[PDB]
């Protein structure tokens, strides 16, 4: 009967993360998670306006703005659905033992085809971050660096078509895999590096501006997530 009201993002909702957390939380705590999944800006606006108790999003840029502006507090990452580098089976041997930075340097050196989302995407700005960390620059103008301007799944097909590489979240690759049953066009070629980790952030609505937000409920949920049992539990999804 007790509940906690959450504004989240349509892409976050689609990962199923929340559908995993909610039953587990109800079991430990007796509280029902209730969420609405909208646009990023609107998810934050819902917290800004005192419509929810907590906010759950996937965009570190604005998350930080948000905290700054005074809208959210207790920013708390939940790691999930890590990014991986994929390409045809040829490539796996190529990078064995390597960090992402070492592999990307190699990609540049040998000029292997790399396909970027090249759209307004969470995956795209992440992938840009990875090149920046690896080379100190985004190879935007290199002949081998192609910007598709397409959804994740379309840019995987382009990478496959041009016998090159791309960066995708694990969830989509799983979907891609269920499509091409049998013998794989595409295969995980690099994973695990810390810079490839994926985080979704929970923030509590600031009680100082939202007198009637259930900040208690918010802090309880956040503490639960942050707790070792759930830290260890989450890592094992």
- DSSP structure class, residue 97: T
List CB contacts of 127: < 8 A, sequence separation 6 or more.
Answer: 83, 116, 117, 167
For residues 4 and 218, is the Cβ–Cβ distance under 8 A? yes
User: 3 by DSSP, 3-state: which?
Assistant: strand
Asked if residue 155 belongs to a known ligand binding site, the reply is no
CA–CA separation, 30 and 3 (whole Å): 9
Angle at 19 between CA 36 and CA 156, to 5 degrees: 90
Torsion sign, CA atoms 119, 121, 124, 128 = positive
The structure was resolved to a resolution in Å of 2.4
Strand arrangement of the beta sheet that strand 3-9 belongs to: 32-38, 3-9, 54-57, 199-205, 72-79
The verdict on whether residue 75 carries a ligand-binding annotation is: no
Asked if 73 and 211 count as a contact pair (C-beta separation under 8 A), the reply is: no
| Residue 21 CB coordination number (10 Å) | 22
Residue 195 marked as a ligand binder:
no
Is 176 labelled a binding residue?
no
What whole-number distance in Å separates Cα of residue 161 and Cα of residue 143? 17
Structure-determination technique: X-ray
Is 145 within any annotated ligand binding site?
no
Tokens at 214, concatenated: 């259930």
Nearest CA to 41 among 32, 33, 49? 49
Q: Is 15 annotated as a binding residue?
A: no
Q: CA 190 to CA 86: how far, in whole Å?
A: 7
Question: What's the order of all strands across the beta sheet hosting 165-169?
Answer: 145-147, 114-116, 165-169, 83-87, 187-190
Is 198 annotated to bind a ligand? Reply is: yes
C-alpha to C-alpha distance for 225 and 152, rounded to whole angstroms: 29
**Residue 10 labeled ligand binder:** no
Q: What domains lie within the chain, and their CATH numbers?
A: 1-80+199-237 (3.40.190.10), 81-198 (3.40.190.10)
């Amino acid at each position: 009967a007790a509940e906690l009201r959450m504004a989240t993002t349509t892409s976050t909702d689609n990962t199923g993360l929340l559908d995993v957390l909610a039953p587990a939380y109800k079991k430990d705590t007796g509280v029902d998670l209730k969420w609405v999944a909208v646009g990023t800006g609107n998810a934050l606006k819902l917290g800004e306006n005192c419509d929810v108790d907590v906010v759950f999003v996937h965009a570190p840029k604005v998350e930080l703005e948000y905290v700054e502006k005074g809208f959210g507090i207790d920013r708390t990452p939940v790691m999930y659905n890590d990014f991986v580098i994929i390409g045809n089976p040829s490539f796996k041997q190529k990078f064995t033992g390597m960090s992402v930075a070492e592999a990307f340097k190699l990609i540049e050196k040998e000029q292997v085809k790399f396909v970027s989302r090249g759209d307004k995407s969470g995956t795209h700005s992440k992938e840009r971050e990875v090149w920046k960390e690896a080379l100190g620059k985004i190879p935007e103008k290199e002949s081998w660096y192609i910007e598709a301007g397409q959804g994740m799944l379309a840019t995987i097909n382009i990478a496959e078509e041009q016998k090159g590489l791309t960066l995708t979240d694990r969830g989509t690759f799983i979907k891609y895999e269920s499509n091409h049953k049998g013998k794989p066009p595409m295969v995980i070629v690099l994973e695990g590096d810390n810079t490839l980790k994926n985080f979704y952030s929970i923030m509590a609505v600031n009680p100082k501006r939202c007198e009637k937000a259930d900040y208690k409920g918010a802090k309880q949920f956040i503490d639960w997530i942050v707790s070792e049992k759930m830290q260890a539990e989450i890592a094992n999804f």
